[PDB]
């Protein structure tokens, strides 16, 4: 969040976040929009995520609506495409005090044209027709990467907005990311409410003969209800 140097939308940088507690409360303290899909925003703290990926880029204020599931546009189809069924938050905030100059901003660009629509969670860092361009500008030829040329005197819909997309998966892997929740000592052979890695249930916990392979973290019954769990603190 508090970085002076971000990334252009066509070459967005995705940051792996793992093996740490993430206090989403700090982001809420920071002028900001916190629209979330798959998880509602308030419930993020009491959850454990498999891996947290931050997709950081700079767009205009009217192109924030293009960063959406099932949305077609310039930025959505040619720069940064979102899946229809991801689990994560989109965070957009205005930063025209750090990303606008009087002459313009040639640090951040966008791919204006492309041959085909771009598949979700993919990045393209690379001719309309008639004559071939052959590496030079000509008829029906364009330099796809065009500059945003930001200014502080522009309108609010054209002001530089810094968008980070926090994507994660839930209850499908051993969770490297967890909320800042204090641990509780484990007792067995007792009826106790349990919250293992963001899974809440009331049950009697006993030693299990099942040998989970390292990838396996949970055991599922024929009703798809967890029948065994591997304790995170002690395996």
């Amino acid at each position: 969040f508090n970085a002076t140097r971000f990334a252009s939308v066509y070459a967005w940088n995705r940051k792996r976040i793992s093996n740490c507690v993430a206090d989403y409360s700090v982001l809420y303290n920071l002028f900001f929009t916190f629209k979330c899909y798959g998880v509602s925003p308030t419930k993020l703290n009491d959850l454990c995520f498999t891996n947290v990926y931050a997709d950081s880029f700079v767009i205009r204020g009217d192109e924030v609506r293009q960063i959406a599931p099932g949305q077609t546009g310039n930025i959505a189809d040619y720069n940064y495409k979102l899946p229809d069924d991801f689990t994560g938050c989109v965070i957009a905030w205005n930063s025209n005090k750090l990303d606008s100059k009087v002459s313009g901003n040639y640090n951040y660009l966008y791919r204006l044209f492309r041959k085909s629509n771009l598949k979700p969670f993919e990045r393209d860092i690379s001719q309309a027709g008639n004559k071939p361009c052959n590496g030079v500008a000509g008829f029906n030829c364009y330099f796809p990467l065009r500059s945003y040329s930001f200014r502080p005197t522009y309108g609010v819909g054209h002001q530089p907005y810094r968008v980070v997309v926090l994507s994660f998966e839930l209850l499908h892997a051993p969770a490297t990311v967890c909320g800042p929740k204090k641990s509780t000592n484990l007792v067995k052979n007792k009826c106790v409410n349990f919250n293992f890695n963001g899974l809440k249930g009331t049950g009697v916990l006993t030693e299990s003969n099942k040998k989970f392979l390292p990838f396996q973290q949970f055991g599922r019954d024929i009703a798809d209800t967890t029948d065994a769990v591997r304790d995170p603190q002690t395996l």
Binding site: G38, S40, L171, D224
Partner: protein
């Protein structure tokens, strides 16, 4: 899944906000009540 995001109930409670969940878990309750009514109808026919 019965047209919901997951079959388990405690994820839908933890992952989604209370107004948003009451849409998913109402679907789940309707689907499970339909399946249970199908089981008490077929068991009544088998009992006859």
């Amino acid at each position: 899944k019965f047209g919901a995001i997951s079959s388990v109930l405690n994820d839908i409670f933890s992952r989604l906000d209370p107004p948003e969940a009451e849409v998913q878990i109402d679907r789940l309750i309707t689907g499970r009540l339909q399946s249970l009514q199908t089981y008490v109808t077929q068991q009544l026919i088998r009992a006859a």
